[PDB]
Amino acid sequence: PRVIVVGAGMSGISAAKRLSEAGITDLLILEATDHIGGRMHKTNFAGINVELGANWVEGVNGGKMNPIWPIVNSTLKLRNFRSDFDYLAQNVYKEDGGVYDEDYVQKRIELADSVEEMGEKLSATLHASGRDDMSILAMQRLNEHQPNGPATPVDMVVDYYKFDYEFAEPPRVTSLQNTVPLATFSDFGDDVYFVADQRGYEAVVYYLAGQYLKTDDKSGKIVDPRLQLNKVVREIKYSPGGVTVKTEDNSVYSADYVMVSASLGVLQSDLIQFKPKLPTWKVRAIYQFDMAVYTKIFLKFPRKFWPEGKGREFFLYASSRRGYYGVWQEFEKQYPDANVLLVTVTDEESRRIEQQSDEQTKAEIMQVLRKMFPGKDVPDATDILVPRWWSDRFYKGTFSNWPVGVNRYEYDQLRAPVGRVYFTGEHTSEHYNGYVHGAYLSGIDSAEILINCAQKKMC
Amino acid sequence: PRVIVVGAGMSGISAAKRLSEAGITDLLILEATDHIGGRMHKTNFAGINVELGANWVEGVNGGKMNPIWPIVNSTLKLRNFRSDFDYLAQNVYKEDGGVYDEDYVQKRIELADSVEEMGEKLSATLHASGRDDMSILAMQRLNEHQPNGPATPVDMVVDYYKFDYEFAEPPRVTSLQNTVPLATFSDFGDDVYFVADQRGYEAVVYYLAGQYLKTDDKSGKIVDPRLQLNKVVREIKYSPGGVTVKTEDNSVYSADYVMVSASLGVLQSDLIQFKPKLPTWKVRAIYQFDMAVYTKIFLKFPRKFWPEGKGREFFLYASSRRGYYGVWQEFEKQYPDANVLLVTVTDEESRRIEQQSDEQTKAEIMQVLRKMFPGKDVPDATDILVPRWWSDRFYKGTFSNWPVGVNRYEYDQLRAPVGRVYFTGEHTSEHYNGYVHGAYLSGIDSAEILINCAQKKMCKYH
Amino acid sequence: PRVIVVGAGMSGISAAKRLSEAGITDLLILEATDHIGGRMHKTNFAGINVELGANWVEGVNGGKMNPIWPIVNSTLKLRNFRSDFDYLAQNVYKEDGGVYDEDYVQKRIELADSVEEMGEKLSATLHASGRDDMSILAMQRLNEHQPNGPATPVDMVVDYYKFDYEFAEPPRVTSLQNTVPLATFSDFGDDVYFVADQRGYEAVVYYLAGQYLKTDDKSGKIVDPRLQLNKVVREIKYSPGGVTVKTEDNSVYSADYVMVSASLGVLQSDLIQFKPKLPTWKVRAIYQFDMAVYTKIFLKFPRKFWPEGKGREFFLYASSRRGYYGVWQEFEKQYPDANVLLVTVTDEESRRIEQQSDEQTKAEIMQVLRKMFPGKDVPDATDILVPRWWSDRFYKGTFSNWPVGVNRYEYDQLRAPVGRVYFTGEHTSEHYNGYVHGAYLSGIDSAEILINCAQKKMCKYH
């Protein structure tokens, strides 16, 4: 059968590979941008390539092997380092200057960790139907016996590092049942490894694609005509007998099936019109799940003014405004001597920031840094890079997050095909939504579902 | 039967009134503070009494009469005014000065309203168990077809005005099925009346209490020994045979039953120790419902610099920071010539603000005001009042809000009695949680359950 | 809670009775016609009351007691007769006259019955999801090894008697899995008893109604104002908090819940407007199930011309046109001096006949009877009664039938409530759709689900 795959991110390339392995080689991959890789994507900043999207292989060293790890660490050997979060208690900055006492902070972290552990015990006892689920915040209130969760600046920043920095939305919106504990770490292991290689974390996608798509023997560039870049799909028409896909440039293509891999945000946006309209059950499951936004703001300075050394890689700023420029990282190992800092924001701060100029964002950040390092002469940053994933029509966010209210059955409806229209992508990953390995395994699983239906008539 | 009622806010006074009516007059009302009324409470601000807590009679002029309305508007004649929100579109300020064009704003308001109406239709069809509920935000996404709800400055303050200003928590955390549409408005009417009387909205509670408690002939002060102020209940021991209640000053009282009317926030804080410990099912029901916080910040100025006139009562500040000093009210009718303004904040901003000085909050507000009225000479406020309800141990918030995740049966577990211990209060109102009328009706309903057990020997709950 | 019950047929009355027993007595039953009983309804014909709708208590003498049986045979002692179909082989008339040879017909019946028995065995092994279901006709081809089901006149009329005369649609549309074997007979017994009493089979419903509705001490008539006749519901508005129902006479009623007992056929028609519209899942379940039509044409003649005697009660006409005036009943036992015959038609023929005049129908029937009894001087019938259930807007058919294509899950979606809107009626009976006992039991079942939701706050999800 002929199958059109919409999108050449990790899931689309992964699904097309699996299909090709089943012998379905009459594929046509239509990608909106001028390149493959989607959310795994590097860029030049301050004369070095940094990741705008995914940056870590998460879940390493555990009971099962994360399928992405071997490719990154053995097949391609991309340069990488295990992140160590053990010294955060020594690096929490006060809103007005200097760090807090490490012992006080270590005890707040312990209290937070302990509450989360009680939440893991509780989650284990909830019903599979989801009828007793609750937000992580409700679990925090119950376990601490209070009418509110973390509320002082230090407790809030600790809370934000533990939850929002992973999920990109606050604990009060997040499903406890479906995030605590999290399968990625329970299955693959607790460590995470930061990829810092000039070829980019995206190399993994190019490696996979080259195992079945044709590449130039000199270039190494993909030249297979089954891959067409700059093809923005805007309409998908389907019937019991086949499908037609129209692109923004006016091309029109036909196939027996279409495998949609565009992000959940794209599907919530209407960029692609389905005709007929997707059924209500599908539409509701789509709008109930969340597409989160995690913004990596890179900054480059004329000189270093922050600490370097053991345990100095990650540091937090405890603002009285929750989530305001709170989580920082410095790259003494990754980008020795570059004078770059990375501050991450999400959700509401991400949408506000994407809406204002880089200069204005730079100015707000300089004010925070100056409060943090009152003893230093802090130079203004020389360059800033603000990724605008939520504003980009081909992504509309960075990764899905599971909200309280959606149960496993409704989440599974996200994966479900509609006639001949199949779906894949990180938001269809059975237990790894939000991750690169989740996009990868989702392409394989979605392809298998289509192969069984198409080749064995077992749908 | 002797019954102890913990708390003399509206639901406790109302529950005690109903018991007394059923002839259960061997009552003891234990109130933590030095006064009755609870969350209906006024205070002197710069020379005028303003309400720290409830301020409106909400739900008036509809198909059924809100029971609070006749007392306010006819029995006591408390001075009051209908709030008119029809002119908001002419009163939305830009982050950086001046108002937006009216027609531009009106269209955003009309789109917001249309999404909500579409949400009311969805809501009516959801399974009664609450199992298919979703947040108000999810419904907005569905209806606007976007991966986010309102996100530009003007659409966000319109959203805040429509939802946070009523519920005190954002749409994304709030239950669609239980708040859209809202029974208070569907049943009692769409209008709301702001009480602005020197005697305070709490006069309604003093009135009900007086229908059954003895009062001093000249002062009208309640003197009945069945009401005991300054008595904070710290422990409730209950058994098959009865209950014992201990206060902080060590008093100990016994009764056949106890009716607890302390807020959900108090129950979530463990101020009262139950012995034996409440059942796990009850404990979980308590923690899963939300106790919201709504902070009315009052400001007094040496002279006026904002507009007055038709449609000027309410105005919004479209900050690029959602919920930042967004909803303003000026008092040309309520407190004429006092030069007072009221900005309301909720939730995360309330918690932040209660934790810092009033001077710091006043200076943040002066920057906002000077940005809104750049052509005026905006003098610094000479007085400010920041109510700290979340910090007050006898309240721990302002009113409950039904979150996504709590279902119908879980809400019933929140109300359910445990042995001889009954619960009452706005958080136990089936359809009016969060309101003065919900506390009033919840008092009568809880009392009736107790009366059935006590007088009809029908002791099984649901 | 206040509950409005739409319709006073067996299920509405049965539901209201069960609610009343749970103590829910604030009920309002709105019935479209001027009487209760619905599809159980008698009429005077030829000076005798005959049944226009149900006439048998089906499923008797089995392992479990059909709940209607005791009311009929013991509490009311309605006059009744066991129907005996054992002599059919002696009473099959050829298209042009005279009966076929008994031995020949018995052989054809024996074959039809053995193909059905093989269908029951196949049915038992089909997957519960309904994925392997097939029509009864497909099972017949498989078992007979032929490219068609019964196709000669005698085989066709035996087939119509065995299936259409029960289900009111042909084997090719009927689900094998859900009708062969049929629960009513497997649970309650293989016998059937024809009710022939002047008080009517509807007395069963009048008896249940009188157990909780007030009746005049003299007239015995129901006089409870909770029952209101001539109220045609045309709109049902519902929200998360209650419902409003408006009747064609323009009255408007309000309640907490509504229990809809009108027929599937009425729900498929547009008689009652739901606001908001019912959800797509619900509307699809409604239109996928079938509402069949079974038309009992009674004829009165001036003298008898057909045989009377052992085995003569039921006879068949083997027309070469399937289903054409094929199953007849003579009433020597029931109405001995009447001279009345009953011919039953269903489905396509019922729809055709309801649309033409009684005179044209009578003329068609006289041509058939004159061909069946060529040796007799057949008199013209002097009266005929054609019931028009499909044309009646308050019924739109006679009883639901389960078609191939619908599985249990989808059938259950017919019974499922939508918010505060509940449904009851024979088409919601878990295992006895199409019968009086099914209507009766569905009323109790539906009521209990509403009682758990409303009283116990436990709204069952599946």
Ligand SMILES: *[C@@H]1O[C@H](CO)[C@@H](O[C@@H]2O[C@H](CO)[C@@H](O[C@@H]3O[C@H](CO[C@H]4O[C@H](CO)[C@@H](O)[C@H](O)[C@@H]4O)[C@@H](O)[C@H](O)[C@@H]3O)[C@H](O)[C@H]2NC(C)=O)[C@H](O[C@H]2O[C@H](C)[C@H](O)[C@H](O)[C@H]2O)[C@H]1NC(C)=O
């Ligand atoms: C619907 O109702 C009718 C009416 O009520 C049923 O018929 C009545 O059923 C009684 C149930 O058995 C029946 O019973 C009794 O009769 C026996 C025997 O009578 C004589 O024989 C005795 C022993 O040889 C002798 O000792 C005695 O003196 C008599 O000569 C007696 O032992 C029982 O104690 C009892 O009184 C009635 O006679 C009968 N009346 C009529 C008018 O039919 C009917 O029942 C059906 O089922 C029973 C099992 C029996 O087969 C009936 O004949 C049959 O009609 C019932 N139908 C259903 C389907 O429920």
Ligand SMILES: Cc1cc2nc3c(=O)[nH]c(=O)nc-3n(C[C@H](O)[C@H](O)[C@H](O)COP(=O)(O)OP(=O)(O)OC[C@H]3O[C@@H](n4cnc5c(N)ncnc54)[C@H](O)[C@@H]3O)c2cc1C
């Ligand atoms: C800022 C950020 C940080 C993250 N951090 C990490 C991390 O450190 N580790 C980790 O494991 N995960 C992380 N993630 C998550 C991870 O990157 C994603 O889960 C994964 O890459 C998503 O792959 P996908 O194929 O599902 O979707 P995508 O990569 O979005 O691929 C979909 C493709 O479809 C294309 N497309 C969209 N619309 C159309 C259209 N109309 N027509 C044609 N093509 C279209 C897009 O251009 C894209 O190429 C991060 C992601 C981001 C963005």
Ligand SMILES: Cc1cc2nc3c(=O)[nH]c(=O)nc-3n(C[C@H](O)[C@H](O)[C@H](O)COP(=O)(O)OP(=O)(O)OC[C@H]3O[C@@H](n4cnc5c(N)ncnc54)[C@H](O)[C@@H]3O)c2cc1C
């Ligand atoms: C800022 C704010 C704004 C609001 N706006 C409005 C509005 O405009 N309109 C509206 O309808 N509603 C509004 N509400 C809600 C309304 O005020 C409440 O729903 C209602 O007043 C609550 O009455 P209650 O009896 O349930 O609780 P409470 O009024 O809290 O009464 C409980 C009583 O128990 C006492 N107590 C607590 N712990 C103990 C103890 N351990 N022992 C003894 N006594 C104890 C407390 O002091 C209090 O008197 C608002 C409330 C607030 C605070």
Ligand SMILES: Cc1cc2nc3c(=O)[nH]c(=O)nc-3n(C[C@H](O)[C@H](O)[C@H](O)COP(=O)(O)OP(=O)(O)OC[C@H]3O[C@@H](n4cnc5c(N)ncnc54)[C@H](O)[C@@H]3O)c2cc1C
């Ligand atoms: C011709 C025929 C033969 C049958 N043969 C038998 C048999 O022998 N044995 C057997 O067991 N079963 C048989 N049945 C089926 C059995 O009669 C029905 O299953 C049963 O009586 C249906 O009861 P109900 O309460 O579900 O519906 P109904 O009896 O239809 O009750 C619904 C009530 O709703 C009223 N209504 C409709 N629309 C409105 C409105 N808009 N507003 C208000 N009220 C409204 C109707 O008037 C009616 O009274 C037969 C039925 C018919 C019609």
Ligand SMILES: *[C@@H]1O[C@H](CO)[C@@H](O[C@@H]2O[C@H](CO)[C@@H](O)[C@H](O)[C@H]2NC(C)=O)[C@H](O)[C@H]1NC(C)=O
């Ligand atoms: C990631 O890959 C490196 C490289 O292959 C691993 O470091 C090698 O590991 C083997 C295993 O016994 C040694 O014999 C080599 O000497 C190692 N090379 C170096 C430079 O130490 C490393 O352990 C890998 N990490 C994970 C988590 O797999």
Ligand SMILES: *[C@@H]1O[C@H](CO)[C@@H](O[C@@H]2O[C@H](CO)[C@@H](O)[C@H](O)[C@H]2NC(C)=O)[C@H](O)[C@H]1NC(C)=O
């Ligand atoms: C609030 O109370 C005032 C006080 O009685 C009401 O205004 C009276 O209303 C009756 C009713 O139609 C009149 O006959 C009186 O003349 C009115 N008095 C005045 C001063 O106008 C008023 O309608 C009430 N408002 C509401 C919403 O009930």
Ligand SMILES: C=C=CCNCCCCNCC=C=C
């Ligand atoms: C390590 C580290 C720092 C955080 N970056 C992890 C973001 C991965 C997003 N996936 C989460 C799932 C969801 C929602």
Ligand SMILES: C=C=CCNCCCCNCC=C=C
């Ligand atoms: C009118 C007006 C302006 C807003 N003040 C009313 C807050 C009443 C709180 N109860 C809502 C329910 C919940 C949660």
Ligand SMILES: C=C=CCNCCCCNCC=C=C
């Ligand atoms: C006995 C006899 C004669 C046939 N009359 C009974 C009709 C009962 C209708 N219900 C069957 C279910 C279906 C569909």
